[PDB]
Structures are given as structure tokens and as C-alpha cells.
């Protein structure tokens, strides 16, 4: 596969998002790292699908709501940032105030 360190680092993020996805499916209110991982992995999959940076900056705000996360988590996350390989190379996606 000739995985570079950056690709191996993203595998860690994908795994942390699997933990969060299973907890959200059990109906738990997610904590700080679960929430960050879940939204970040969602953006990476959107980039793999060929969605635009502009589209994902908006789609990222509809992954989790205040009722799905623990008290104070939305305030702990003013933004989520992640880079992914889009059809036109690596790009940075910033999701502002993702949880409302």
C-alpha cells in the first residue's frame, strides 16, 4: 500500500470515529473526543466521494446536535478542522460552530 506517516495518522482518526459511531448508535450522548472524531471522519469520507470544500463546510454542521452531546461539548468545539485528499488533492475543511 506504501502507506506514508500521514495516511497511518488518518487511520487512527478513522478508528476513533468507529468508537464514536457505535456509541451514538447505542443512544449515548457523545463526549469531546468522540464528537471531534465523528465529525472529522464524516468530512474525510465526503472528500473521498468528491464533495466540494464549500459543501462539506456546511454538511459538517449537521452531523451532531446539542441533544446528542454531553453538556459543554458544543462550547468546547468552536470549530473542527481536517484535511483530506479531494479529487483535486489535499484540502483543508474548517467546520465552524459544528454543534448547535
Amino acid at each position: 500500500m506504501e502507506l506514508t506517516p500521514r495516511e497511518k495518522d488518518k487511520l487512527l482518526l478513522f478508528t476513533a470515529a468507529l468508537v464514536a459511531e457505535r456509541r451514538l448508535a447505542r443512544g449515548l450522548k457523545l463526549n469531546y473526543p468522540e464528537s471531534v472524531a465523528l465529525i472529522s471522519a464524516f468530512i474525510m469520507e465526503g472528500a473521498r466521494d468528491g464533495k466540494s470544500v464549500a459543501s462539506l463546510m456546511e454538511e459538517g454542521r449537521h452531523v451532531l446536535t446539542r441533544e446528542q452531546v454531553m453538556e459543554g461539548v458544543p462550547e468546547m468545539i468552536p470549530d473542527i478542522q481536517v484535511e483530506a485528499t479531494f479529487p483535486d488533492g489535499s484540502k483543508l475543511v474548517t467546520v465552524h460552530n459544528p454543534i448547535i
Binding site: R6, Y32, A37, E71, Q81, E83, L92
Partner: protein
């Protein structure tokens, strides 16, 4: 012109009278003082203050600091103050007002071409934690402690061997020499403890001369009156500390007999509540004594609804007891006691217990000394309300009392407070920068000797350092020769005089311990209480002047599920 206090706080961090919640606890700190001149704050960035001829002056390197932490909210045993911190030659240079004396007033921290900037506006800055109950079971404990905000580790061991799994002892000159050599590789300051259990003083003097800064007396090597007496006699000759895990079994005598053997000499009592070890059921009575520096280990901190169940079973597994043997069950029940575990939290709140520590991977969690100290402070504020020493509508005195437990008090106990343990001029610049929402749980930056040693770091290939995944990664302060310059290996006076550093080719900066014998309970910063304490032999009830000392177990704690993935 004027700026609103809310707009000021957003731009430069809080100022005098503003309050900040510590993480998700009920603890609130209030800014007591601010060393700035309003309008003259230094901020770094595009079109900002720290620029040539502006906040940055024309001075040579000898005339300016190497590093400035701007607009820091300092939390230390001595105050909760807003200030700039200057670092020069890896040491704290000044706490005050940074800038350029050519154009700014009241500058005490000159910034020049040779100055690096750490932006601390909106952050809390504390001294690095000092853990004095480390079992050197594995070297991975160093990064785990450093990530938690602990910059100095004192303990003993040789790796995952039976002796080290049970005790903080590095036995003999050969292993002491090998562990001092291995310490150069770790990004924490280290001091070693030798095996103190012997009745021949020359076998102890050889270990001190090899490099140990203290001796551990542990019941697993025989914590008898003769061994304790021998170690204390050597400690008094050689200016090193003695750490004690007393005779739980009461084989050689009861707690009064161990206290008689100590004979008023200075000693650090580990896990003083006794669940971690010690005369059953009354080792806790040692905190009444002026010569005893008492610490707690962290699994019993604070008392929770899962404490007794985890401990009764944790002990049963360590000692290979099996719940079918009545005498093994009678032993387990004599060591794990709800009465002393609940009293311990109150004794910390009153300042009768002076230090907190881990007991790393031997009935203790290396990455939780700081987190658990704050969980106790929270639980005590909830249950007890304001301390008698408290002034104002804040928790400042309680915060100063508790931060001293993992910073200055361990440093004073082990004779290293001349180098580490607090944010004070001339001390090593071991500093921790915290975002208030993550205070005590996940630091923003950990600085060792003036260099950043570890920090959260996002995707290495990203266009900025913040994109996911963000996780703790070692920095330049943790690499080869830079790490050697930025960490200390502590040695005894005998080892330093005998040229141990040169003989072993130790690469790190060396510091020598001093003042282990003169330190007493009265010297424990904000934690000098000597209560008239008793333990009932039948009920295990702890009383101070006849009054029952107890607390209620927590169901849920702050600094827990909101922060951690597992």
C-alpha cells in the same frame, strides 16, 4: 480611551477581579493581581506589538530573555496573578511586564531579536508536577506522566521485575548506574530511590554514593525497627530522604513501634491512608507528627461509589489471595477500609496530608496525579463549602492548598525545591500551559527547561497545526542532545563529589539534592496541620479531637467522561 472588561478579557485574557472555572469542576479562581500597564500589553502577530522598534527592542542576547510567555494567568502556591513570564538560559528570569524599555513603561522582561514568544493569553500557566512515588516498571511511564503535566519523577526500580512491581527501590550500585544512564533518554527530570532495608549502614552508604537521592523502606524487604533506624542514620549523615511503606502485618510492632524507631527523624510516609500499604488499620495517625511528611497515592482519591469494589479486588489480585481463604479475606478487609479512604479526602482539605503521588502501576495511575488532586478539591468544596482561610467569593485558597500537593511540597520533601516545584526566579523553566476548559486534564503545551517537550499536534502534513487527528507528540525538547540540556538528573552530594556523572558519562544537566533532613511538617506549603488523630481498632473510625472525620462517595466526577475517549 476605554475598552469594556468583556472585550479586554477576550483579547488579553482575564484581569483583576475576573473569575475562571477550572475545567468542568465547581472550582472558580479569581485574578488577584495583574502586573501589566493597561494599553501596553504585548501580543504577537501580524500588525501586533512584538515587532522591531515597538514591543521588541535593540538589545543584545545577554540583555533580553530567550522566551516570553505573554499574558499568562499564573496559578501557583503563592498567588493567582496575571503576568508575562520571562525565561533565560532555561531558567525563570522574571514574572512581570514584558516589552521594549525604549518605548514602553515599567518593562521588567526585555524582549529582543533573541526572544521567542509563547502566547499565553486566555491560558492558565502552572509549574510542572513532581511525582515522588514512581515505580520504574517501564520507560513509557515518562511520556505518560509528562503528557499529564508532570515534569519530575522520583522513584525506584529496574523494569518489570518482582522487586520493582512491589517497591520503589533501585537495588545496588550496578542497577543504580544503569538506571541513571537510562534516565538521559527520558524527557522528565529524574531522581532515584535505593533499597533502604538493611541493618548494615555500609550497604546503604554504597547506594547513596552510587547516585540515589533517597532510600525506600518497604515491608516487602522487611520494614523492621532495625532497618528503619539504619536507613535514617545514613540519611542524616548523607542529606538524602527516607520514604516509608510500613509493616502492614504489625509483625515487628504496631504503628507506635515504627514511630519509636523513627525517633523524631524526618521521613516521607507513602500512601499514609494505608490502602496502598502500612500498619493496619492505623498508619493514618502518622500525620499528627512534626517530622513526618505524609503523601497519598491516587487510586483512593477521591472516595467514589466504585472505590471499595475496585480496591478489594485490585489487592486480591496483586497478593494472589483467593476469596475462599478466611485469613486472606481477613487481611484484605484489614487493608481496604471505607473509614480511612473517606477520612483521607477531608485530611487533604484540612492540610493534614501534604503531598499527592501516583504509586505508578503498583496501585496507582501515573497519568492521574493532577486530575485526581483536582477531583478531591471539587468533592471537598461540594461537601464542605469554603475553607476557613478563604477570602472573597472564589476558591483561590483551596486552589493554592491543592496545587502545593503536587508541586512545591514533593520538591521540598525530596530536597530539590532549589531547582523545581514552583514558578520562581532562578528555578528551572518547567512550565505547563493549560486551556481553562482542559485545566488539570489535557495541557496545551509542556515546557522542559525552556524548550517545549510535548504538546498536542495535528496532522503533520496539514497546512496548519490544528487539523485532526490531534494527539500528544514529543517535541524538540524531547530529542537527543536538546533533551539532555533541558532535563536534570538529581544526584546525592556523595555521588556528585565522587564524580559519578563523569564516570557513567551522564549527558544531562546534573542537580544535587540538599535539605532533606531539615524539612518538617511545618514547612509544607499550606498543608502544615498536625491533627490530634485517632483510629478505633474495632470500627476503624477516624477521629480528630474526638470528632468523626468522614465523607460521602461520589457517583460522578468532573475531569472524567467529558474528556477521555476510553
Amino acid at each position: 480611551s476605554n475598552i469594556s472588561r468583556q472585550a479586554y478579557a477576550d483579547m488579553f485574557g482575564p484581569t483583576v477581579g475576573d473569575k475562571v472555572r477550572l475545567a468542568d469542576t465547581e472550582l472558580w479562581i479569581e485574578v488577584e493581581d495583574d502586573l501589566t500597564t493597561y494599553g501596553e500589553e504585548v501580543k504577537f502577530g501580524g500588525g501586533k506589538v512584538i515587532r522591531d522598534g515597538m514591543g521588541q527592542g535593540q538589545m543584545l542576547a545577554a540583555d533580553c530573555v530567550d522566551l516570553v510567555l505573554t499574558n499568562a494567568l499564573i496559578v501557583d502556591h503563592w498567588g493567582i496573578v496575571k503576568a508575562d513570564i520571562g525565561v533565560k538560559d532555561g531558567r525563570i528570569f522574571a514574572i512581570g511586564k514584558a516589552g521594549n524599555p525604549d518605548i514602553q513603561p515599567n518593562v521588567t522582561i526585555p524582549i529582543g531579536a533573541a526572544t521567542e514568544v509563547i502566547a499565553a493569553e486566555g491560558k492558565i500557566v502552572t509549574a510542572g508536577g513532581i511525582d515522588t512515588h514512581i515505580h520504574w516498571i517501564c520507560p513509557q511511564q515518562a511520556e505518560e506522566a509528562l503528557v499529564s503535566g508532570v515534569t519530575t519523577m522520583v522513584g525506584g526500580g529496574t523494569g518489570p521485575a518482582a522487586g520493582t512491581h512491589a517497591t520503589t527501590c533501585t537495588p545496588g550500585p550496578w542497577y543504580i548506574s544503569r538506571m541513571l544512564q537510562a534516565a538521559d533518554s527520558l524527557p522528565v527530570n529524574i531522581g532515584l530511590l535505593g533499597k533502604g532495608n538493611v541493618s548494615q549502614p555500609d550497604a546503604l552508604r554504597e547506594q547513596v554514593a552510587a547516585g540515589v537521592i533517597g532510600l525506600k523502606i518497604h515491608e516487602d524487604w522487611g520494614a523492621t525497627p532495625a532497618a528503619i533506624d539504619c536507613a535514617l542514620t545514613v540519611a542524616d549523615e548523607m542529606d538524602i530522604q527516607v520514604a516509608l511503606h510500613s509493616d502492614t502485618l504489625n509483625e515487628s510492632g504496631f504503628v507506635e513501634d515504627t514511630l519509636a524507631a523513627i525517633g523524631g527523624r524526618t521521613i516521607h510516609t507513602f500512601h499514609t491512608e494505608g490502602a496502598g500499604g502500612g500498619h493496619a488499620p492505623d498508619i493514618i495517625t502518622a500525620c499528627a507528627h512534626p517530622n513526618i511528611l505524609p503523601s497519598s497515592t491516587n487510586p483512593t482519591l477521591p472516595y467514589t461509589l466504585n472505590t471499595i469494589d475496585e480496591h478489594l479486588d485490585m489487592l486480591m489480585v496483586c497478593h494472589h489471595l483467593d476469596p475462599d481463604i478466611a485469613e486472606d479475606v481477613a487481611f484484605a478487609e484489614s487493608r481496604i477500609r471505607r473509614e480511612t479512604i473517606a477520612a483521607e479526602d477531608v485530611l487533604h482539605d484540612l492540610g493534614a496530608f501534604s503531598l499527592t503521588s501516583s504509586d505508578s502501576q503498583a496501585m496507582g495511575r501515573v497519568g492521574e496525579v493532577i486530575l485526581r488532586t483536582w477531583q478531591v478539591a471539587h468533592r471537598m468544596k461540594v461537601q464542605r463549602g469554603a475553607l476557613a482561610e478563604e477570602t472573597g467569593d472564589n476558591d483561590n485558597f483551596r486552589v493554592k492548598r491543592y496545587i502545593a500537593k503536587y508541586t512545591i511540597n514533593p520538591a521540598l520533601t525530596h530536597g530539590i525545591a532549589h531547582e523545581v516545584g514552583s514558578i520562581e526566579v532562578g528555578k528551572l523553566a518547567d512550565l505547563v500551559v493549560w486551556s481553562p476548559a482542559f485545566f488539570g486534564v489535557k495541557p496545551a503545551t509542556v515546557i522542559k527547561g525552556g524548550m517545549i517537550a510535548i504538546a498536542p499536534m495535528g496532522d503533520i502534513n496539514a497546512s496548519i497545526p490544528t487539523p485532526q487527528p490531534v494527539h500528544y507528540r514529543p517535541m524538540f525538547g524531547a530529542l537527543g542532545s536538546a533533551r539532555h540540556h533541558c532535563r536534570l538528573t538529581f544526584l546525592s552530594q556523595a555521588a556528585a563529589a565522587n564524580g559519578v556523572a563523569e564516570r557513567l558519562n551522564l549527558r544531562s544537566a546534573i542537580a544535587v539534592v540538599k535539605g532533606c533532613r531539615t524539612v518538617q511538617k511545618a514547612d509544607m506549603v499550606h498543608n502544615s496541620l498536625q491533627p490530634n488523630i485517632t483510629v478505633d481498632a474495632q470500627t476503624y473510625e477516624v477521629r480528630v479531637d474526638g470528632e468523626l472525620i468522614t465523607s460521602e462517595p461520589a457517583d460522578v466526577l468532573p475531569m472524567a467522561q467529558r474528556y477521555f475517549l476510553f
